[PDB]
Amino acid sequence: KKPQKSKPGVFSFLDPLAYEIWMCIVFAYIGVSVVLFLVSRFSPYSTNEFGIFNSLWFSLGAFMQQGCDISPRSLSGRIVGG
Amino acid sequence: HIRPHRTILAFVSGIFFILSGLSLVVGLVLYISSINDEMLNRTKDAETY
Amino acid sequence: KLSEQGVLDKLKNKWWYDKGECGAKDSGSKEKTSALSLSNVAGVFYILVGGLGLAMLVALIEFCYKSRA
């Protein structure tokens, strides 16, 4: 039989990892940003900046390996970052 | 919500919600892993799907 | 006489291997590549959640040191 060309799917780049992994990356993304906000904004906090909009932006920059504007300065913040 | 005084009740309740979701993740991760390897050990056949 | 002519070896090759259901090249020909499953990289998730819980325990004992000071 003559070989014919098969068109790949448009989301075929997502194939080296299984779909069960791509779900857990999003769950791990939300989980770190919630914990990093709680562990930074305690009751005596100084001059802290890690709000929830900064904490989602810090975790997004860390996964893409593109750097960050600001870093954690508290020890419990450096643990959850590392 | 009944007693707005003694403000510590909202903060402690926030911790129980966060520890709830983290317990649910390791529940799902251990669940999906325990399912996936059980498909893996079975011997493959040309006539069986 | 049959052993030196290779007739006893030709008969054993026929009934054992040619009548075999799966050959050596039969299982060798089938290859496939698979995506990574969760069970491979499951340990990194276990380090991650355990890294989260230790950060909360440090935050408790630091505030207790701040209250004493």
- Is C40 within 8 Å of chain A by CB? no
A50 touches A40 (CB < 8 A): yes
Q: How many CB atoms are closer than 10 A to CB C62?
A: 14
Q: What is the DSSP letter of C11?
A: H
How many Å apart are CA B44 and CA C26, to the nearest integer? 13
Contacts of C51 (CB under 8 A, 6+ apart): A79, A80, A82
**Are A16 and C36 a contacting pair at CB < 8 A?**
yes
Helix (H), strand (E), coil (C) string for C26-40 = HHHHCCCCCCECCCC
| Method used to solve the structure | cryo-EM
Helix (H), strand (E), coil (C) string for B12-49 = HHHHHHHHHHHHHHHHHHHHHHHHHHHHHCCCCCCCCC
How many Å apart are CA B49 and CA B41, to the nearest integer? 14
How many Å apart are CA B27 and CA B22, to the nearest integer? 9
Q: Which residues pair with A17 in a beta bridge?
A: C36
**Are A35 and C62 a contacting pair at CB < 8 A?**
no
